[PDB]
Amino acid sequence: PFFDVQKRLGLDLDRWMTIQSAEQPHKIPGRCHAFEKEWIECAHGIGGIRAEKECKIEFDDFVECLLRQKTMKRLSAIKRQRDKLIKEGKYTPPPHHLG
Amino acid sequence: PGIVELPTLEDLKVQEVKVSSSVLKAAAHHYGAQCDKPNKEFMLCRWEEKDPRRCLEEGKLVNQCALDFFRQIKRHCAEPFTEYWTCIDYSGLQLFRHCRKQQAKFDECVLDKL
Amino acid sequence: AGRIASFLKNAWAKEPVLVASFAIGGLAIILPSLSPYTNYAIRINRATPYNYPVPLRDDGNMPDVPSHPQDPQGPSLEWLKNL
Amino acid sequence: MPLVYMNIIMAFAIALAGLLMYRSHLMSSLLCLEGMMLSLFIMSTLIILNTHFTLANMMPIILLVFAACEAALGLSLLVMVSNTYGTDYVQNLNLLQC
Amino acid sequence: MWFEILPGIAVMAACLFIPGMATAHIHKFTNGGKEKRVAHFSYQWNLMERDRCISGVNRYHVTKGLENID
Amino acid sequence: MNPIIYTTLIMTVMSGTMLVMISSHWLLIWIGFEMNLLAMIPVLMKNFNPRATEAATKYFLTQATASMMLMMAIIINLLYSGQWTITKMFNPVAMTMMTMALAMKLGLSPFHFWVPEVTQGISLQAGLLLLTWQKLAPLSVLCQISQSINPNLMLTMAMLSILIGGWGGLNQTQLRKIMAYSSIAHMGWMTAVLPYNTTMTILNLLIYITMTLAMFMLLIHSSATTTLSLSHTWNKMPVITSLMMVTLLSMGGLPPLSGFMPKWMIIQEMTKNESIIMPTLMAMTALLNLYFYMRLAYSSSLTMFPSTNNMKMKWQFEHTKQMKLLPTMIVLSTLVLPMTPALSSLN
Amino acid sequence: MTMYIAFILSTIFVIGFVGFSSKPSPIYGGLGLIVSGGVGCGIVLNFGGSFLGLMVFLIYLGGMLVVFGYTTAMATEMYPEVWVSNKTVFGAFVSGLMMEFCMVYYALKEEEVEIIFKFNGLGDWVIYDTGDSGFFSEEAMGIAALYSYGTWLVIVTGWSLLIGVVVIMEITRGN
Amino acid sequence: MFMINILSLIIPILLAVAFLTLVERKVLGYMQLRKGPNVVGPYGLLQPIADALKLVTKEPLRPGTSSISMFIIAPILGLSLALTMWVPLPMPYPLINMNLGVLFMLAMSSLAVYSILWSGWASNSKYALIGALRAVAQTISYEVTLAIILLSVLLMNGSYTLSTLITTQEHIWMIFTSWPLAMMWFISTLAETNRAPFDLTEGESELVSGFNVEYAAGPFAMFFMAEYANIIMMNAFTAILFLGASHDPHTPELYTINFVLKTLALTITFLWIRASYPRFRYDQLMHLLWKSFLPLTLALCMWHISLPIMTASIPPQS
Amino acid sequence: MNIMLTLLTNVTLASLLVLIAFWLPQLNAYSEKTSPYECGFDPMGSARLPFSMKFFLVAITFLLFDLEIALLLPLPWASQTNNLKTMLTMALFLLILLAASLAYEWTQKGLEWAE
Numbered sequence A: 001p002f003f004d005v006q007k008r009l010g011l012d013l014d015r016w017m018t019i020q021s022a023e024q025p026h027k028i029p030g031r032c033h034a035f036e037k038e039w040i041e042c043a044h045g046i047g048g049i050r051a052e053k054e055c056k057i058e059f060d061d062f063v064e065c066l067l068r069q070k071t072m073k074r075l076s077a078i079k080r081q082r083d084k085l086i087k088e089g090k091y092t093p094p095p096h097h098l099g
Numbered sequence B: 001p002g003i004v005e006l007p008t009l010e011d012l013k014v015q016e017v018k019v020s021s022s023v024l025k026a027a028a029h030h031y032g033a034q035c036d037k038p039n040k041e042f043m044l045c046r047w048e049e050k051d052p053r054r055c056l057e058e059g060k061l062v063n064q065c066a067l068d069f070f071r072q073i074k075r076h077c078a079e080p081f082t083e084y085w086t087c088i089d090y091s092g093l094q095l096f097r098h099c100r101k102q103q104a105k106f107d108e109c110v111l112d113k114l
Numbered sequence C: 001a002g003r004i005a006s007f008l009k010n011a012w013a014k015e016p017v018l019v020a021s022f023a024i025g026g027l028a029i030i031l032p033s034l035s036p037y038t039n040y041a042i043r044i045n046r047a048t049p050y051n052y053p054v055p056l057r058d059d060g061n062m063p064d065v066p067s068h069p070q071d072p073q074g075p076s077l078e079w080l081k082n083l
Numbered sequence D: 001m002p003l004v005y006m007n008i009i010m011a012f013a014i015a016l017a018g019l020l021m022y023r024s025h026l027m028s029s030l031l032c033l034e035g036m037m038l039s040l041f042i043m044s045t046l047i048i049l050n051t052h053f054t055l056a057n058m059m060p061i062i063l064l065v066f067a068a069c070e071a072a073l074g075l076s077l078l079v080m081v082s083n084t085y086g087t088d089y090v091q092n093l094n095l096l097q098c
Numbered sequence E: 001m002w003f004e005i006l007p008g009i010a011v012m013a014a015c016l017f018i019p020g021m022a023t024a025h026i027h028k029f030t031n032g033g034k035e036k037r038v039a040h041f042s043y044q045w046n047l048m049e050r051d052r053c054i055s056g057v058n059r060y061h062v063t064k065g066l067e068n069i070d
Numbered sequence F: 001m002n003p004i005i006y007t008t009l010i011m012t013v014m015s016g017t018m019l020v021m022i023s024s025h026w027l028l029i030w031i032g033f034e035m036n037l038l039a040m041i042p043v044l045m046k047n048f049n050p051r052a053t054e055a056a057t058k059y060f061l062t063q064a065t066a067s068m069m070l071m072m073a074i075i076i077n078l079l080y081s082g083q084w085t086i087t088k089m090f091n092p093v094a095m096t097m098m099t100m101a102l103a104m105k106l107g108l109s110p111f112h113f114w115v116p117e118v119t120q121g122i123s124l125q126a127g128l129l130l131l132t133w134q135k136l137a138p139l140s141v142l143c144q145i146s147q148s149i150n151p152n153l154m155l156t157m158a159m160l161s162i163l164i165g166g167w168g169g170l171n172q173t174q175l176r177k178i179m180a181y182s183s184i185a186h187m188g189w190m191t192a193v194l195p196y197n198t199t200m201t202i203l204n205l206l207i208y209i210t211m212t213l214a215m216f217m218l219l220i221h222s223s224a225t226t227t228l229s230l231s232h233t234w235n236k237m238p239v240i241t242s243l244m245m246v247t248l249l250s251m252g253g254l255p256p257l258s259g260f261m262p263k264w265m266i267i268q269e270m271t272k273n274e275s276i277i278m279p280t281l282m283a284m285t286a287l288l289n290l291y292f293y294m295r296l297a298y299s300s301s302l303t304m305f306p307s308t309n310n311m312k313m314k315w316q317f318e319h320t321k322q323m324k325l326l327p328t329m330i331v332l333s334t335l336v337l338p339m340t341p342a343l344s345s346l347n
Numbered sequence G: 001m002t003m004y005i006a007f008i009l010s011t012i013f014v015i016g017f018v019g020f021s022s023k024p025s026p027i028y029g030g031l032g033l034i035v036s037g038g039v040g041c042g043i044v045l046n047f048g049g050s051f052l053g054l055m056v057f058l059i060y061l062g063g064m065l066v067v068f069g070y071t072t073a074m075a076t077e078m079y080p081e082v083w084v085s086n087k088t089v090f091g092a093f094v095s096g097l098m099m100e101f102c103m104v105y106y107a108l109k110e111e112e113v114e115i116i117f118k119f120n121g122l123g124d125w126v127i128y129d130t131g132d133s134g135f136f137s138e139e140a141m142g143i144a145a146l147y148s149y150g151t152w153l154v155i156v157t158g159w160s161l162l163i164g165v166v167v168i169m170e171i172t173r174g175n
Numbered sequence H: 001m002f003m004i005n006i007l008s009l010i011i012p013i014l015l016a017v018a019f020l021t022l023v024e025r026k027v028l029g030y031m032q033l034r035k036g037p038n039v040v041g042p043y044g045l046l047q048p049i050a051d052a053l054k055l056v057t058k059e060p061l062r063p064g065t066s067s068i069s070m071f072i073i074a075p076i077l078g079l080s081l082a083l084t085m086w087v088p089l090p091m092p093y094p095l096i097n098m099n100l101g102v103l104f105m106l107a108m109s110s111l112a113v114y115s116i117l118w119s120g121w122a123s124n125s126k127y128a129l130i131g132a133l134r135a136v137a138q139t140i141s142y143e144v145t146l147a148i149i150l151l152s153v154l155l156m157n158g159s160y161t162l163s164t165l166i167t168t169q170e171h172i173w174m175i176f177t178s179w180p181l182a183m184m185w186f187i188s189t190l191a192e193t194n195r196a197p198f199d200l201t202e203g204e205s206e207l208v209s210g211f212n213v214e215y216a217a218g219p220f221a222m223f224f225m226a227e228y229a230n231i232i233m234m235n236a237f238t239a240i241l242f243l244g245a246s247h248d249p250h251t252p253e254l255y256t257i258n259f260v261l262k263t264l265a266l267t268i269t270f271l272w273i274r275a276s277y278p279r280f281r282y283d284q285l286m287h288l289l290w291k292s293f294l295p296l297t298l299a300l301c302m303w304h305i306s307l308p309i310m311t312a313s314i315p316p317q318s
Numbered sequence I: 001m002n003i004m005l006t007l008l009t010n011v012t013l014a015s016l017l018v019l020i021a022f023w024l025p026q027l028n029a030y031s032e033k034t035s036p037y038e039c040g041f042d043p044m045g046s047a048r049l050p051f052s053m054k055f056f057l058v059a060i061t062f063l064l065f066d067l068e069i070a071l072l073l074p075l076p077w078a079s080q081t082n083n084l085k086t087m088l089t090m091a092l093f094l095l096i097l098l099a100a101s102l103a104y105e106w107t108q109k110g111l112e113w114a115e
């Protein structure tokens, strides 16, 4: 906040939605609750300058959980390689993954 | 950036209880009271450890205690229970509100026989 | 009294809908504070168990928390049955 | 970041491009203005639903509350420019060149 | 007279009766007698999916009572 | 417009800007901008002249486009970070989208062809309110997000503003038009120092607010809108235009007038950051701003201009309106250099 | 074929988006927005947002109705334009269709699109999450908390809309 | 077994409107001392078929100034919207068990007006544009009361699911708790479907046409069958929402019989008022809603938000 | 699946009825049968020139009021909260401003239709 009246006046106006690990209705946790919880607990009061260099892997795990960028990339490679291998005829899916 | 220690398939080969959702919905209250101890222990492991891969055995105890609950019900009140869960199953929403009479047969059966 | 009664009677003649709507609109705000069942509505909503009542580890010295659902100690809502 | 994100992000670009190329109509211009609002609402809905950001599900609603509010402002402005100048092509209001 | 109006109602009332009866009977016919299970929430759907897996024949309505376990 | 509605319409504008400077949530910041735009459009077309309608219109499409781009840049930041707090932007495209999204609200780079004629069409009263109050909100957002700002883009935003603002003002006669380009010139000055020290642009904002305020309500008192119409004020009000000299000199940064305090203090800060070529540049191109200030100074009372015989009964009557803080505003707008170290109060 | 309706629905969303962004006659622009708006509601419904999907359906339909209700009121052309009509709108239209159809071709043939951000084609069904929702829909409870957790948002939204009626009359009054 | 279900709904629906046109004149005539159609078949039981068959064999023609595309799609919009809207109606068990059935019907019913002016605008006629512009502001202003009335009543439901009305008014009819809202709900339904205290959409006395301005055999048949289907439902929706009926889970036929009877009685009332009142002028029908219906609408809304709280009767969400 | 099949069947049924509408009845038409209808005598040339109606002010407030009903739509699920006092105060607050907006719109000509 530019002029932090919420901190001074000691009431909440929007510091209840700004994060995913806040008190959600009926304690419905978000997808990446644990990932961001570690990240915020990591860089709390340390400052933005120190946060961007020290709490880096915690952010990367959290940002990955948000998008699954690498995990979906891993799945994309599994399916593509499986497709060409099955199409050529080296190996066929086992009966558990048919029914 | 590491490995994933997926448990042995053998560990995921415990007895798989086989009753339809209406059967469980009929047992409900009586199951909850007479099978709470293994149930609570398993979920506390679930909430504390936050990892089912560390709480399979507590899951197994639930299945074994669930079997004993259902093993007793067949031995003593198989017929009224069969009458009851059938009456629940007919409803599309499985409401206890429409099968009070069959419930009255069921609870008195297990009360004076189990 | 004379000023108010003349105004209410006059509005009751020309624009019955407005004086009507302002009535129920007025009552819709002031009774809910007065009526005593508002606390019951909070209790009913609070008592509804959408989530699991997650068990809390027993390290002793928790006399009020029951060990079994049928135990007498704990939040009892027999008032709902009576109400 | 699957292809549905590409579709609505690339969509918003054409809403941006569509707005920034006024050809002959204020009304059609306002259409592209409210067009932007779809992709923003739709993308926002996809985000907080995918992430289960339940408390933030109100954000698409508040977007819409302030959405039509601008939409009303645009047509109300369009009322007078068309009323006192006849049409809504955005070329006849160049009296403010000097 | 006014009773001549009634044939106008009757051929409509029967026609409007069909969708109520057809939907009610089709659901019962296609779900083995019992009403079609309604899943307004994910928990209801979870019971239905477990019913499909448990039945073996991949039919949610096909129900197994106590006799499945022993 | 009825007086009571006008007040509440203004209060909504101040509340909308205040919401921007106190909220920590990105959605609320966007809301504060939306409320600011919504309550201002009626203010511009208060008198309902034909000009004001498209003047208010050009306001609307420009800022709505800016608001929509700002919303989009917020959304991407949420997508890649899951955060609504105003700390920094974790997607470079998200930031590189907001700079222009905020710029068009400020009117700095070629996102500026709305500022001149929107000032021209609307009345002088809303012109003052447009060029001073409407800049606290977008600048406040920039100050908070000042950490994650692309210096190459932000500096170019300001450098373009100074050049165009100075160049454009040389070919303007309508006093409102010259004020808009002059304001655009000061836009670059405040925004150039933004990446380095945010305390400095606050200081330049405060000085520029006093300059634009004091200049405008002098124009209101003179009741003039073109250079020729201002010229005759020497016959009626000599002190107003004589005071207008010092404000014009101060607005050009000619020291020891207060207007030097930003231009001086800013240059000192960037040279601390090894920026030398660029600070020399705006030092050079601030002079074209000074040109049409002196031409205004020459035309107002430095050389008494031909008058009109209809001015006799004009001298027989005095102003009934009561501009306040005008005697105060001139003091801060002219002589506060001895209190320069007071910038640390902002810090 | 029912592989994943998300792309197909979003494609019609873009093609409908292309339409009114090409600057037709305003009435035909309403149709181009409505198809995109209707299918956009379909996209959100498919993602679990049942309430929000029909929500944008009801509001927008009323929103765009007064839009082209206005165009025939005082923004109508004595000879209205059409999708073909002038070569400019024809050029603006066909440009949009060929554009989007190029990106989707660029999208579905390598699945590693890197325009601006990264876009990999693997199926929007993947990003879904495994887990129940109890006896409540998550979206409905989230937007229900507006009256309990969002009392600040209600105030600013309510006041702005009330001011919204004030400006609309004040702008449109005149004289 | 779903195509059979759908075609077990579409055919009965189109046959219901089919003979509603016979029970219109045969009721309208008897209320104006006439006798109605009793020549084509016994008691007129074949007149609509004779009407329909003619209306698919007499020369259709697009207007010379029409817009072909929008002229043709408007009947598609009217008919498909009317049919698709019956889908979530909970006759014992609804065909499609939508979780938000109420919101669905509100959305699509708000869409059935795009047909009326797309037809009006494309027809390029002076009476067409007048009737189109009459209707749009007529419906949307009547839509604000439509939305709030539904919300205020459904606050006792606890959800928007249409099936829950069966459970909600299980012991007591809903009208006995919301009769003031029932009156404006019935009037609004008379207004959205354009029956004749507010049939100004057609405006035959002053606008000769407007439902179907140059529209001919086929397209005229659609724009008729698309609004007479709305007549039957908007009373079926009124019946399901206010006048509940006993529903035995084992024998749904009793509920369907009861549900049909309420729709039939309500539909007769739609025909009954149609021949007992003059025509509202445009400003009057707008004044009635914006100046008399809405103030009572909001006031009774605030009552129904507070009422469950003061009486501790918050309905179950599930 | 179920919803889209129903949507498809309706549009095919409607479109088929159009197809048999324009093809089964054969046409013997000319340029005078396609003339626009104007109750007999020749039209003066209209139906596309600006036809300015008067309820534009209340037409656009409907859009504003339709946003109010969007804001107060989630009320059925809002009652299922643990802090009804705050929910009741806010729920009535939106209704009050909705009433207040209508009342102020009423007083200043507003709903009156321009002459």
Ligand SMILES: COC1=C(OC)C(=O)C(C/C=C(\C)CC/C=C(\C)CC/C=C(/C)CC/C=C(/C)CC/C=C(\C)CC/C=C(\C)CC/C=C(\C)CC/C=C(\C)CC/C=C(\C)CCC=C(C)C)=C(C)C1=O
Residues within 6 Å of the ligand: H007, H011, H014, H015, H017, H018, H019, H021, H022, H024, H025, H048, H049, H050, H051, H052, H055, H194, H195, H196, H199, H202, H203, H204, H220, H221, H222, H224, H225, I008, I009, I012, I013
């Ligand atoms: C001012 O106020 C006013 C009003 O009121 C307020 C009014 O009221 C009126 C109206 C005036 C009056 C009432 C006065 C008297 C006038 C009349 C009665 C006019 C009568 C008008 C009519 C239209 C007659 C209506 C009567 C009848 C009998 C209609 C009967 C209906 C039919 C013959 C059709 C019924 C439906 C059928 C047959 C459907 C068949 C469907 C199928 C076979 C299946 C189709 C679907 C499929 C096969 C799906 C599968 C296909 C797939 C999947 C294809 C896939 C394809 C791929 C390519 C993929 C006016 C004028 C008015 O001024």
